[model samples]
Target: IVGGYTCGANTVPYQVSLNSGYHFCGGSLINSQWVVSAAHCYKSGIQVRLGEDNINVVEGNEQFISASKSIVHPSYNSNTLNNDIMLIKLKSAASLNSRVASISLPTSCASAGTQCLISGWGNTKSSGTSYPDVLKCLKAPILSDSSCKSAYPGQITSNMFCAGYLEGGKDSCQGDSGGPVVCSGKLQGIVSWGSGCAQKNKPGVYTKVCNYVSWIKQTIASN
Candidate 1:
């Protein structure tokens, strides 16, 4: 939610604050012991903080856990940004409560023009100069694959999807990567990348969860 305002503290319990000693990316708790995020957001020393609404201070509901392992898509390509998804296994299962929960993965592909919401603590602008302490959320529309392909040309791959306003001024920016793009009360997308924060029709790119449902289930089972 780069170009959006602060969201309610309890609006998204599945939301997670990924930290490498500090807040860096957003993630979603998909299960008691698993989290889904962008492969590009991976790094050593990374940890996940659940039930967090503000990054600037500790909250009563926060639960910090060390990542036991990080599994990145084998086909992930940094150049093309293809298969840009990852799974993080926690050292221990999270203690779910009213403030901590998991989000349901999508069972089907999100249709074009469907309204969705993106939430995170990413930068407020494209400059990557400022970030919010509290989580933010923005309502964006899903764009047809054809429209998104036109914007990125050959760069847009089947593993990725797009959503945003062509008019600009509203999108996910730096630090928002790996956040959730929820639609129909289900986890439909994972914020992956963008041309620049919110640059007109460029829109924000995401890793389509529906495309990798099998892989996700397999990976989680095997791990």
Candidate 2:
């Protein structure tokens, strides 16, 4: 995350690292077994590490588990990047503790100007490579749909939303994909994509979690 600060130990229990040998993306634990992330991060043999803070340093709270089952949203679009949501079921249930817990889903839609917290192991630099080993977090407010639409005309769908400074300097960059965007202590969005890592007029885009509430429920219930 650009223009962000390091997260303290056990500060974000619901946040996890999606590892493909290395930290590839971020996710949030939705339950004892299910994790929600971006569909674009999907791949076989993905490992989910709960209670994670620093990726390089050893942490006692870390829970390393594999994805037993992966489910990408039915209508996920790669080209247009619509419905960019995915669920990863853990091989074993995570133990609940102060350093490990699940996140509750959003009950109401987030309005414009609502500030949210987003944490991840994504790149910290806007122009160069600077992946942080420790998790970083940024507090940004949600932008209006019209503003977002104008920022990325014909690309910002209802399934997606923007949350960052339009003036730039702060956003979810590479390796932050699928991370949680929490508003009012509830799941709001998933880090999906952006243009050139926090450029001006290019706020970070995310999968609007509220719009897919029913889909997430139906998928989990059927599975």
Candidate 3:
């Protein structure tokens, strides 16, 4: 009854690792230096494992890196839950091998109607599960700005994105925080805040990676 869905659900490929023995959900490598993830995923000390099946076991012949610096978005607010995003700078540059790789951020978000793939290790149901080892994923369509605005009102600013099933069933859950919401092979958003896990009428909310493009670039450049 672990939180994350089985990795077979659409399988939006990415990487994640735990801190010490603590459970970690998802993260996307944007460059040799930076990794994009939900701000809440930040832990005091964590190791990055590339291409692993079970989070508790280190995969052999994998490129495991350490975190050099973790920059949680300054605007992140756990209360109202605004700006739940962050970037992880690896202690070493990631190898560009076929198995271990990085993804490019989208220059422009996919059209409002476009569908995005979300992957994470969150609760399978609303009550919260024990947490699953293998990653899980589901496909959701990107919401139109008008629709998102209606959903989040003042909270759904340009810096955020939304996706999930409107009717019910199949969605990102609790342990899935910091996972990527990928669309057409490009990173467009990151899993952050949501209502009840997989509850109806409450689509999962995410940080719009595209909205903070300049922040990402500038942050990377400065480091």
Candidate 1 lDDT, tens digit per residue, 53-133? 888787778899999999989999988879989999999999998789998888898999899889999889765578789
- lDDT of model 1 at residue 96? 92
True lDDT of residue 68, candidate 2: 92
lDDT against the true structure, per candidate, is 0.90, 0.92, 0.71
Pitting candidate 2 against candidate 3, the one with the higher TM-score is 2
lDDT of 2: 0.92
In order of appearance, the predictions have TM-scores of 0.97, 0.98, 0.87
lDDT string for model 2 (153-188, tens) is: 889988989999999998999999999999999999
Output the TM-score of candidate 3: 0.87
Q: Tell me how far the alpha carbon of residue 178 in candidate 2 is from the true structure, in angstroms, after superposition.
A: 0.3
Best by TM-score: 2
Best-fitting candidate, scored by lDDT: 2
**Which stretches of candidate 1 lie above 4 Å from their native place?**
none
Q: What's the true lDDT of residue 137 in model 2?
A: 93
Off by over 4 Å in 3: 1-5, 8-13
| Error at 190, model 2, angstroms | 0.3
Q: Could you arrange the candidates by TM-score from highest to lowest?
A: 2, 1, 3
